[PDB]
Amino acid sequence: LNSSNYAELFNNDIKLFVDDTNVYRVTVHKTFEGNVATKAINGCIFTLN
Amino acid sequence: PPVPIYVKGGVWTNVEDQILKAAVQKYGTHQWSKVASLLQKKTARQSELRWNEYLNPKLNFTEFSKEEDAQLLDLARELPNQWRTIADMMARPAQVCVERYNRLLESLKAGDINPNAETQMARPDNGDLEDEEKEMLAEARARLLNTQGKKATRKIRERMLEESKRIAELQKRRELKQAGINVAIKKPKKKYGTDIDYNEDIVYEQAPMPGIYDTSTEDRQIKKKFEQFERKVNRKGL
Amino acid sequence: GSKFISSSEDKTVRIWENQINVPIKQISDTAQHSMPFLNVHPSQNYFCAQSMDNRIYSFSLKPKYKRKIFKGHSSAGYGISLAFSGDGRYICSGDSKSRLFTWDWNTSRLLNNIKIPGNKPITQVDWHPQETSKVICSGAAGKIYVCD
């Protein structure tokens, strides 16, 4: 799906974009020791037509 | 975020000499990489040269006596330009020997690398400081402070946390005592089957093997005193 | 009305936004101790906590929450409230020995130290915002004392 195909998204047939970039997110926090640790937070799977 | 210094031979300032001295006092002579890590813009070998050539108090920086000076002319005659051997024969640093030999036989641009920088005099500093030198002394005090391992530092932390945990555990009991419900103190659990509780018994009680004298009334007097102390701690609370 | 604070037995403080379930700020040190009471000063640039090591530390209410020290009282046993003047220059605390302590917020100097009838200690100390120079202390003794 390049920029020269670009209008193929707008045919009649149904299709979906899936995206994962916000699925695994974390927050960094200080531990009791020197090093920091990551704890996961909520995410979303971004699918649209 | 600092761009890399690949060649670290520079001019020894005052700051780096003093951090090298207060690093050699703690780290000792034979660890040089751990000394030169403390002061950036210099190398472990150049720290070794700056100690063994200039900053060492055993080294002999005085004026030459007349016997010393004639000894220098004669030794420079016998051993042709072998200046480490000559300086070993005089117990003086070799750069002092070479410059004083030039002074006997007599009677740098900019953008050059000075090879003899470790043997030369220091540069005193401008009045306030530079910013990187503030950072250098801050991290140098931070690294000269610590004398602990990982296990011992974690032990400090665990003792403080167990202390505050006991305080909270007594706080809730005192609140419930005010309410009128007396929760007894739970004991720590045993990590193995014959782990010893130390209020049940005198654990390895050794009797003092009696002698000729008589100790009945003193036994009674001690037993009276201890019973009265326990009652007073029960009522009034120490 | 947006964020809030909690303290816990595990010697840390967290700050949440209203319903996010993510702590945006963890106030945790090595030599810290847990605080059984939090309060926010009326000038709203600081909130302060009564710590277990018989002191009172104070942190910012603005972002980059960071840490004055109010000392001179023994409150390690019980967990004791603290209040503020309705002008914002005085902080008042209780004690395990039935006396309250009033510091000046502007300089952290212990101004006065007033004892209270009743052998039992005093925990809840509350100030009247309208009528100035009026405190009420009370504790395990049971009566409710109106201090000047």
Place this chain on the structure above:
RNA sequence: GUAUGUAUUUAUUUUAGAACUAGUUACUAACAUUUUUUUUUUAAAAAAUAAUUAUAUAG
């Protein structure tokens, strides 16, 4: 990423201060993917060249 350790009680035992402000350093974090060969002048001139990458690391 492991090792390893720590946390998880209910079935009730008798009575000198106040305010405003932003970036610089270190360290840590299994958390995250804008071509090649030159030449020439002091931005412009020349020459050139070819249906698309891994979920894999531990004492």
